[PDB]
Each structure stands twice: as structure tokens, then as C-alpha cells.
Amino acid sequence: PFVEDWDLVQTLGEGAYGEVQLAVNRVTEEAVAVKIVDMCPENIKKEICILKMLNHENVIKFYGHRREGNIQYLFMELASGGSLFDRIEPDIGMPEPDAQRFFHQLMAGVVYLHGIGITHRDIKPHNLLLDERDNLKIADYSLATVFRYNNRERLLNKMCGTLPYVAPELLKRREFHAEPVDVWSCGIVLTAMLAGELPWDQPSDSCQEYSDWKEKKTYLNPWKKIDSAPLALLHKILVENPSARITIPDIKKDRWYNKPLKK
Numbered sequence: 420p421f422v423e424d425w426d427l428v429q430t431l432g433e434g435a436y437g438e439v440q441l442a443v444n445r446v447t448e449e450a451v452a453v454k455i456v457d458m459c460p461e462n463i464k465k466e467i468c469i470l471k472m473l474n475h476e477n478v479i480k481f482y483g484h485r486r487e488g489n490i491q492y493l494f495m496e497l498a499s500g501g502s503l504f505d506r507i508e509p510d511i512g513m514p515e516p517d518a519q520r521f522f523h524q525l526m527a528g529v530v531y532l533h534g535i536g537i538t539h540r541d542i543k544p545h546n547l548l549l550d551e552r553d554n555l556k557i558a559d560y561s562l563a564t565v566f567r568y569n570n571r572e573r574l575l576n577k578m579c580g581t582l583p584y585v586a587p588e589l590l591k592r593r594e595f596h597a598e599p600v601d602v603w604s605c606g607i608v609l610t611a612m613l614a615g616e617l618p619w620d621q622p623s624d625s626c627q628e629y630s631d632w633k634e635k636k637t638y639l640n641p642w643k644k645i646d647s648a649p650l651a652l653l654h655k656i657l658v659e660n661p662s663a664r665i666t667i668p669d670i671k672k673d674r675w676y677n678k679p680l681k682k
């Protein structure tokens with residue numbers, strides 16, 4: 420039984436749907452991340468099925484799972500570097516070359532997900548982890564879902580995620596395309612990395628900071644802290660109409676995205 424093989428040392432944090440712990444094996448001392456859930460059978464079955472699909476250098480590794488009656492045990496690679504959240508200095512961000520590198524890696528992982536028809540739905544720095552060489556890994560598949568199957572796209576029609584990161588259409592439209600929503604959250608992550616603050620509580624008209632952006636007041640914070648090149652990218656990403664929003668193929672052609680900054 421689980422408790423005979425593993426010791427739960429501490430809480431690593433909460434995901435969208437549960438909580439994950441640092442587990443250390445009682446024989447080998449191998450340290451792993453474990454998500455423990457007392458079975459929704461329907462959602463957890465879904466989370467496990469997506470987890471089994473994943474194989475990419477910028478997505479967390481899934482080791483497997485154990486069911487002990489009603490409780491499911493999900494085992495995954497521990498991120499020795501902790502989270503990206505912890506590299507963002509409040510009100511400062513991080514050095515632009517470090518931000519660009521992490522943004523390159525984030526885009527690599529998101530392209531991989533979208534290419535297998537999965538949308539993450541909750542991209543934010545808490546869910547972006549780092550291995551021992553600071554390679555970024557997209558974690559937490561509790562909200563992830565299928566948006567393309569047999570080459571047919573399905574629109575999403577459920578609101579979820581985290582408000583300061585969600586795209587405006589998720590709050591307004593009854594159904595919407597999955598990919599532009601993930602692209603938007605990437606832009607908020609990039610903003611956070613370069614300014615060390617979030618731009619708004621949510622992207623709604625009742626939020627003044629979001630109105631300010633739409634009116635192009637980039638002389639205000641956080642935008643004033645961001646160099647003109649990454650800012651120009653952020654103007655293409657944080658576009659209100661998802662059909663006019665930049666796609667990942669075009670992000671990959673952006674001037675800042677291609678600027679040499681780092682060894």
C-alpha cells in the first residue's frame with residue numbers, strides 16, 4: 420500500500436482541481452511529485468488520459484498512477500528548479516534575456532500541446548516549472564481538454580482558468596476557439612516576466628486597467644517598464660478580437676522573439 424512505499428514530505432501547491440505533494444520513496448529516497456485525489460471519477464479519468472499522451476521536453480513527465488479503492492495517486496517528475504513564479508521579482512520581473520528564453524520554451528510546449536489537440540486552459544507562472552538546467556515545463560492538466568479530434572476542431576463553451584490570465588472572449592462569448600485563449604495567457608505570462616506585475620484583474624470593461632490598454636496608454640505601468648520590442652509583441656498578443664490575435668506561427672516571426680540576446 421502507498422504509505423508503505425512513499426512518504427509525503429510537504430505540500431508543493433494546489434492545481435486547478437487538487438493538491439500535489441513532494442513524495443519520497445521509503446526505499447530509494449527518490450523524490451517525486453504526487454497528486455492525490457479521492458474520487459470526480461469522470462474528470463480524474465480524463466486528466467490521467469491526457470497525462471498519458473504527453474511526451475515533450477517542455478511538458479512535465481508523467482510516471483503513472485495507482486488506485487487504492489476510491490483514491491487515485493498520480494506520479495510525476497519533480498521540478499528541481501521550482502516554479503517560474505518564483506523567478507519573477509515583484510515589480511521588476513527578470514532580465515529580458517531570461518524572459519525571452521523562457522518564452523521560447525513556453526511556445527515550444529504550447530505548440531506541442533496544440534499539435535496533439537490539447538488545450539491547457541490555465542497557463543500562468545505557477546504552472547510553469549523548471550528542471551535543474553532551468554528548462555521550462557508546462558504542468559497541471561486538471562483543466563486540460565481536447566479541442567481537436569480526427570482533424571475536426573471543437574469550440575469550447577465552459578469558462579475556466581484564472582481571471583487575470585483569461586482572454587476577454589472567454590468572459591463574453593458563449594463558445595470560443597481554444598488556441599487563441601492559450602496564446603493570450605502566454606502574453607500575460609510574458610508581461611509578468613518583464614514587469615513583475617499583472618496588468619489587470621480581468622479583461623473586462625468594468626476593469627479600468629484593461630480599458631487603459633485598449634486606449635493604448637502604454638506610458639502607464641506595467642507597459643512603461645517594458646522595452647519597445649517586446650511591447651510590440653505584446654500589442655499583437657493582447658488583441659481583444661481573437662480572430663485578429665496573433666497566432667503562434669506568427670509569434671515565431673516577431674522581431675523581439677528573434678532578437679539575439681543571450682548566449
Ligand SMILES: CN1CCN(c2ccc(OCc3ccccc3)c(C(=O)Nc3cccnc3)c2)CC1
Binds near residue numbers: 431452495
Ligand atoms: C527544491 N524544491 C524543488 C521542488 N520545488 C517545487 C515547487 C513547486 C512545484 O509545483 C507547484 C505546483 C504546480 C502545479 C500544480 C501543483 C503545484 C514543484 C513541482 O515539482 N510540482 C509539480 C510537478 C509535476 C506535476 N505537477 C506539479 C516543485 C520547490 C523547490
Ligand SMILES: [Cl-]
Binds near residue numbers: 567568569570
Ligand atoms: Cl485524433
Ligand SMILES: [Cl-]
Binds near residue numbers: 504611615
Ligand atoms: Cl506574478
